[PDB]
Design goal:
The structure is cut from a larger assembly and holds 5 copies of chain A. Chain A is mainly alpha-helical. Chain A is built from 13 helices and 5 strands. Chain A has helices at about 10-15, 20-25, 30-55, 90-95, 115-120, 120-130, 140-155, 170-180, 185-190, 195-210, 220-235, 250-255, 260-305; strands at about 5-10, 60, 130-135, 325-330, 330-339. Chain A has a two-stranded antiparallel sheet with strand order 1-3. In chain A, strands 4-5 form a two-stranded antiparallel ribbon. In chain A, about 55% of the residues are buried. Chains in contact: A-B, A-C, A-D, A-E, B-C, B-D, C-D, D-E. The interface of A and C includes residues 163, 307 and 310 of A. The complex binds a molecule of 2 linked components (NAG-NAG) (3 copies), linoleic acid (EIC) (2 copies) and 2-acetamido-2-deoxy-beta-D-glucopyranose (7 copies). One 2-acetamido-2-deoxy-beta-D-glucopyranose binds near residues 48, 52, 76, 77 and 79 of chain B. The PDB classes it as viral protein.
């Protein structure tokens, strides 16, 4: 996982809704809503920062070579197909299809939530309570383009583009030097080039078959998305708590009591909802720290396995690491480690 | 409240705003009209049949009367009725004119002046234990007034009785009218009174010359429920026309709120009046007059962001409505420049076909900048310079020189 | 925090012990909650700072105390060395690295067939300046005459794809 | 936690339902806050 | 260090003990105990 869902909270909307008296009473707190919004904004900025660190390591966009004469090695499964509206690979398409986001887009209009849909739709209920979801700065198409440039550089230039000034080299000789890097002489690579290319193609096809089947293996991104959705749904659900008041509805209290008698109940509800928001923000901060650690690990792996050959054991797959290929995925990255 | 820029200034607690994009409060729609929907009842509540009754019941045999289908215009009691005690527990008195009551029951009896205080949810005493007990979660109003001019006789009024010597305390809203002989001592009684056996009912004195604590007091306890069931007794509030598909304030059977009312496909059961979602908020209501089901939707909806190049640079701002498609609109204003990117409609920024490095992150691949007249421009961010590698199966590139680079990393 | 005032002095001068007790309790609860929130945020920021400091210590160990082969761990390019510098609440690493500057095109072959046997550079790559073939290191163009001292023989020439014939000096 | 006592048994034996409700609510809020603080600290230590 | 102590909390037992009235009043909160238990279960699974 690389990034998590960025959220914003309208504290007045969540705590009080459309109640003017409740907002006037909540004005006596003030700074807590600002603190929660500041923490949420920091998390949202950190998500885009993590995405940029993981995927925007190189600023030099390399296109797919036309000839595609890589000494029997086949990369069409990890290379984009222009037929798709998004210039992402077939394996990237499989990864995208295996993760279901809470919302397909990011624009839910008022007319779409008008009526009973305000209750049946979870997103409508979240938005009617001041909880909004901010989109990532980089779209999936741009992340796919960054992955495309990285893959093109690592296939056409190998490791040189990671150190700047990409130098072209035939893929057979790149494989020979990578074999030399793991203690195997290059004549072994050159005398078994057909066999090695066939095994690499077979392994790529096996990964494609595994991804196309019911086996997901993408549980981390789905867990992140489900955690964010569950946190938002729990925040919505906690509005039914009385918090020691006569009722959990501000409208009932206002229609049932005068200003003095309703003041204590509204204060209790405000305190409870502020506590719920604080708990949500603290949990979001902890999950953001975990996601930042994961994204730092992903960036390090992208630097040391895709931009070069790593001698660290079990850092870029099991076995003697040869190379790695990046792929975009919903809120995450997928490394194909060739060893 | 002047503009989103001023809202951001207030939120930041500063008069100057740095360049960037700031989330403001969600889009708010103020109500336009106020509507009241009460069931059409013209008959007045039987105030004369309750507070003007010629004869009242004893406290041990307190009378319970059902009140239904009436308007509780208690101001008519202002002319002739003076009440020493009027305490409401589950409702504020000042709201009594703006509410509808579900199950109105009036419990009438006569007690001593000193025993009026015992008519409360959590009191102890002779009346509270053996005659009349109020529930702990009692919702209603207790009214008591001196009736020395009515329930007192020169020779002594003995028509009012109270229960003494009960085995156990009465349950809330429970009536005990048995006349069995009480057994105070260990000797069993056989329907006769003597020594440790006494009649459980004792009569009040109630003479005109008695003290104010020994004078008769008529007590009426009104018990009802609020804002949970259809209800048939309503306050003296005039109903207005029903307004749909508009953001209005509504008063449905005493339940007040703000929102938009739309026709509902929900089929309410005959005993149901209100519908609530998983957040316990009233999202559906049955009209007391037309008997139709209406969905209630909050007026405020949609996130709003404000993009500024910095107050030290210019006062021009752009507004992004994250839940508005610009293709009336739920926007504060629509001035000239309308782009309608992904992630909302952008108003106040000029779209350009050129791609630059991101300056102010709008989102969904869209960024904003302050360019040169100076204005805010929105564009698609550029991932980097386009390149091609002259790949071949027999061609290599080898460096002939080098550069000793020294970079800085801050940790 | 729901009290009549945010000042304890005003409440104490305005109410007796019993009436001021609830207001003081509300203020105490609110201020304790504020302190708890501050401490939690400080703990999260301290965890982030500890991660950053662990990264800084690792970089000091692997870039200043030695030469790192990890890509982009001690600067962009081929890492040569690093120099530490103190800074307010932080460290500044000056990473000295080697970057290729002037690339040139060459015609390259995987192996050379001299006498029916395949030869391999064993250190770099075979290149041609148009008519003659040399062997040079990959990161710097230093052409050398292809001899048996800078080549090794493995197998025949009928298996290697792209092998060309050229003279290997003895 | 601002209540008359920290023992629910004493409050229940000392007050009726209405009067004890506020004290029990105060105790519930305080103990829930303590549990929340413990869980947050456990989460931070688990991340470490 | 590799793992830490895995803990579980019975929120009703901690807040109210054997008090039935306190549990009835705590029923008006509900989701907070579930959230705390979910976080604790996540920590316990993360330890293993
Ligand atoms: C590289 O792999 C692709 C498969 O991803 C090969 O495309 C297949 O080609 C065969 C016949 O050549 C077709 O029957 C399949 O339907 C193709 N699969 C596709 C398009 O997904 C491609 O031929 C391989 N490259 C080489 C040089 O063999
Ligand atoms: C080394 O392993 C490879 C791959 O497992 C072997 O190649 C296989 O050889 C059998 C016949 O012995 C064929 O049926 C398979 O199709 C081959 N596999 C592939 C991927 O080409 C190889 O024989 C083994 N031994 C040597 C000396 O290379
Ligand atoms: C309701 O009636 C029951 C039964 O008639 C009462 O329970 C009895 O209480 C007496 C003492 O008060 C005992 O001696 C009996 O053994 C009990 N019988 C049973 C079957 O429980 C009960 O007290 C009455 N409740 C009220 C409020 O009057
Ligand atoms: C005939 C009984 C109808 C009861 C309807 C239910 C709720 C309506 C509420 C209160 C009505 C009684 C008010 C008595 C005191 C009047 C004001 C005063 O003098 O201080
Ligand atoms: C002789 C004194 C013994 C005191 C023992 C200590 C606590 C016992 C409590 C209360 C006893 C006095 C009750 C007076 C009111 C009775 C009920 C009523 O009429 O409303
Ligand atoms: C109660 O009776 C008195 C005397 O007959 C009368 O003046 C008054 O209007 C009556 N009030 C009601 C509410 O009937
Ligand atoms: C009065 O209310 C009844 C509901 O029982 C309704 O059927 C009727 O139309 C209403 N009359 C008017 C004039 O609104
Ligand atoms: C807005 O609506 C039009 C159709 O009227 C649609 O084509 C467009 O995609 C919508 N905008 C977004 C951002 O989806
Ligand atoms: C090598 O030749 C190609 C054209 O075949 C050219 O695009 C490329 O710039 C050349 N490389 C160098 C380093 O001159
Ligand atoms: C290639 O190099 C050799 C030796 O340096 C030289 O004799 C020859 O002329 C060169 N050829 C070209 C085309 O530069
Ligand atoms: C490159 O491909 C051509 C095909 O026309 C072939 O003749 C040549 O030998 C190949 N060179 C290498 C080094 O593989
Ligand atoms: C190299 O020699 C072999 C056999 O002598 C011959 O088949 C081949 O064509 C030669 N290479 C070239 C480029 O002519």
């Amino acid at each position: 996982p690389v990034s998590m869902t960025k959220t914003s909270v309208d504290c007045t909307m969540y705590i009080c809704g459309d109640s003017t008296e409740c907002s006037n009473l909540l004005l006596q707190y003030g700074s807590f809503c600002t603190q929660l919004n500041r923490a949420l904004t920091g998390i949202a900025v950190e998500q885009d920062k993590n995405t940029q660190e993981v995927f925007a390591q190189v600023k030099q966009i390399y296109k797919t070579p036309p000839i595609k004469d890589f000494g029997g090695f086949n990369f069409s499964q990890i290379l984009p197909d222009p037929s798709k509206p998004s210039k992402r690979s077939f394996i990237e398409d499989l990864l995208f299809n295996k993760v279901t986001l809470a919302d397909a887009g990011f624009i839910k209009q008022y007319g779409d939530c008008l009526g009973d849909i305000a209750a049946r739709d979870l997103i409508c209920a979240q938005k009617f309570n001041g909880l909004t979801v901010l989109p990532p700065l980089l779209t999936d198409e741009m992340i796919a383009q960054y992955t495309s440039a990285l893959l093109a550089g690592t296939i056409t230039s190998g490791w040189t583009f990671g150190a700047g000034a990409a130098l072209q080299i035939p893929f057979a000789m790149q494989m020979a030097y990578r074999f030399n890097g793991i203690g195997v002489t290059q004549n072994v690579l050159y005398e078994n080039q057909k066999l090695i290319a066939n095994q690499f193609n077979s392994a790529i096809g096996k990964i494609q078959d595994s991804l196309s089947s019911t086996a997901s293996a993408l549980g981390k991104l789905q867990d992140v998305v489900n955690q964010n959705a569950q946190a938002l749904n729990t925040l919505v659900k906690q509005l039914s708590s009385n918090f020691g008041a006569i009722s959990s509805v501000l409208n009932d209290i206002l229609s049932r009591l005068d200003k003095v008698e309703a003041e204590v109940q509204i204060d209790r509800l405000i305190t409870g909802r502020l506590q719920s928001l604080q708990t949500y923000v603290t949990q979001q901060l902890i999950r953001a720290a975990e996601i930042r650690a994961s994204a730092n690990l992903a960036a390090t792996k992208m630097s040391e396995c895709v931009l070069g050959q790593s001698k660290r054991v079990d850092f870029c797959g099991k076995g003697y690491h040869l190379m790695s290929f990046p792929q975009s995925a919903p809120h995450g990255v997928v490394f194909l480690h060739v060893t | 409240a002047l503009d989103p820029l001023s809202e951001t200034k207030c939120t930041l607690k500063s008069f100057t705003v740095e360049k960037g994009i700031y989330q403001t409060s969600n889009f708010r729609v103020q109500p336009t009209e106020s509507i009241v929907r009460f069931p059409n009842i013209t008959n007045l509540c039987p105030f004369g049949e309750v507070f003007n009754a010629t004869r009242f019941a004893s406290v041990y045999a307190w009378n319970r009367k059902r009140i239904s289908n009436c308007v509780a215009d208690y101001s008519v009691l202002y002319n002739s009725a003076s009440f020493s005690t009027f305490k409401c527990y589950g409702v504020s008195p000042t709201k009594l004119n703006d509410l509808c009551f579900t199950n109105v029951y009036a419990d009438s009896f006569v007690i001593r002046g000193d025993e009026v205080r015992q008519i409360a949810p959590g009191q102890t005493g002779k009346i509270a234990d053996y005659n009349y007990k109020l529930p702990d979660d009692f919702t209603g109003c207790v009214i008591a007034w001196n009736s020395n001019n009515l329930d007192s006789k020169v020779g002594g009024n003995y028509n009012y009785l109270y229960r003494l010597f009960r085995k156990s305390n009465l349950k809330p809203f429970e009536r005990d009218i048995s006349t069995e002989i009480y057994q105070a001592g260990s000797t069993p009684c056989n329907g006769v009174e003597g020594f440790n056996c006494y009649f459980p009912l004792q009569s009040y004195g109630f003479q005109p010359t008695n003290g104010v604590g020994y004078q008769p007091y008529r007590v009426v306890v009104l018990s009802f429920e609020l804002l949970h069931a259809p209800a048939t007794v309503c306050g003296p509030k005039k109903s207005t026309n029903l307004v749909k598909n508009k953001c209005v304030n509504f008063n449905f059977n005493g339940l007040t709120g703000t929102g938009v009312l739309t026709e509902s496909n929900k089929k309410f059961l005959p005993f149901q009046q209100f519908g609530r979602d998983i957040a316990d908020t009233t999202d559906a209501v049955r009209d007391p007059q037309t008997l139709e089901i209406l969905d209630i939707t909050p007026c405020s909806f949609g996130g709003v962001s404000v993009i500024t190049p910095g107050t030290n640079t210019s006062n021009q701002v752009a507004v992004l409505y994250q839940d508005v498609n610009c293709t009336t609109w739920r926007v504060y204003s629509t001035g000239s420049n309308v782009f309608q990117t992904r992630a909302g409609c952008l108003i106040g920024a000029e779209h350009v076909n050129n791609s630059y490095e991101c300056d102010i992150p709008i989102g969904a691949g869209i960024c904003a900048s302050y360019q040169t007249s100076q204005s805010i421009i929105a564009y698609t961010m550029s991932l980097g310079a386009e390149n091609s590698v002259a790949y071949s199966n027999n061609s290599i590139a080898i460096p002939t020189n080098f550069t000793i680079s020294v970079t800085t990393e801050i940790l | 925090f729901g009290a009549i005032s945010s000042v304890l002095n005003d409440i104490l001068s305005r109410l007796d012990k019993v009436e001021a007790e609830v207001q003081i309790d509300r203020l105490i609860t609110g201020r304790l909650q504020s302190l708890q929130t501050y401490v939690t945020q400080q703990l999260i920021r301290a965890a982030e700072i500890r991660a950053s400091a662990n990264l800084a210590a690792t970089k000091m160990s692997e870039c200043v105390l030695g030469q790192s082969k990890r890509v982009d761990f001690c600067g962009k390019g081929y890492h040569l060395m690093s120099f530490p510098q103190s800074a307010p609440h932080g460290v500044v690493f000056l990473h000295v690295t080697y970057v290729p500057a002037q690339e040139k095109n060459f015609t390259t072959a995987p192996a050379i067939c001299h006498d029916g046997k395949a030869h391999f550079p064993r250190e770099g790559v075979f290149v041609s300046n148009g008519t003659h073939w040399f062997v040079t290191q990959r990161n710097f163009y230093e052409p050398q005459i292809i001899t048996t001292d800078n080549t090794f023989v493995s197998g025949n020439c009928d298996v290697v794809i792209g092998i060309v014939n050229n003279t290997v000096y003895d």
